[PDB]
Amino acid sequence: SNALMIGRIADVQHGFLGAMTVTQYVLEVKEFIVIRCMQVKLGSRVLVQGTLRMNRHVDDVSKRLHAYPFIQVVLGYVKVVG
């Protein structure tokens, strides 16, 4: 399921999961969603095209299933528009 969104980068992560390095961003749209990328700076206004992932995981403490949604950029792009 594809999504096209506009907003401001509020945070940046250089991270790792499942043997792969990833860059993540917090996009403020006020709500936020994480962008996951497998010239974008803090405070940049961006347009993002990618796949909306609900990304449900079981909470360690409550043992309840929650979504941890993200836009998957692989096909996909994030372009500075500010």
């Epitope: 945070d11 999961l17 499942g18 941890y68």
Partner: nanobody
Framework: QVQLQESGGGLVQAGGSLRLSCAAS????????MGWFRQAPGKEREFVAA????????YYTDSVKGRFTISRDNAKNTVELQMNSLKPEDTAVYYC????????????????????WGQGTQVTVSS
């Protein structure tokens, strides 16, 4: 609004072991990725080990792989570093750190992206 406090440091002989522990207090709900770092006098602070919020993903600097193990207890708000087969090269002040970046499974591996720091604990390994 977050305090990190290390414990478990000290002196050991080469080949020995230590277990470091870090306890998080205050606004712990804001914390996600947790990590251990180290710094020797006159040197830059370096990444040692880090662990995702959910504990599923870990990352280690090359020189500690197979020797150090990071783990966390989200019910106690602690993060721990089991250090086996210690070498003189591991001598440094060790710091625990916490990242506010909101992600369940992805571990932060960039030093400057961590937001809170403990006061540090000295680890010394004699030859």
């Amino acid at each position: 609004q977050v305090q990190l406090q290390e414990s478990g440091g000290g002196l050991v002989q080469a080949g020995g072991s230590l277990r470091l522990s870090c306890a998080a207090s205050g606004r712990t709900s804001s914390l996600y990725s947790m990590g251990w770092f180290r710094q020797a006098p006159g040197k830059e602070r370096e990444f040692v080990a880090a662990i995702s919020r959910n504990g599923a993903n870990t990352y280690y600097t090359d020189s500690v792989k197979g020797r150090f193990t990071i783990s966390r207890d989200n019910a106690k708000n602690t993060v721990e570093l089991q250090m086996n087969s210690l070498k003189p090269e591991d001598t440094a002040v060790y710091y625990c750190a916490a990242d506010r970046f909101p992600t369940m499974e992805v571990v932060t591996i960039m030093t400057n992206e961590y937001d809170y720091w403990g006061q540090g604990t000295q680890v010394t390994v004699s030859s």
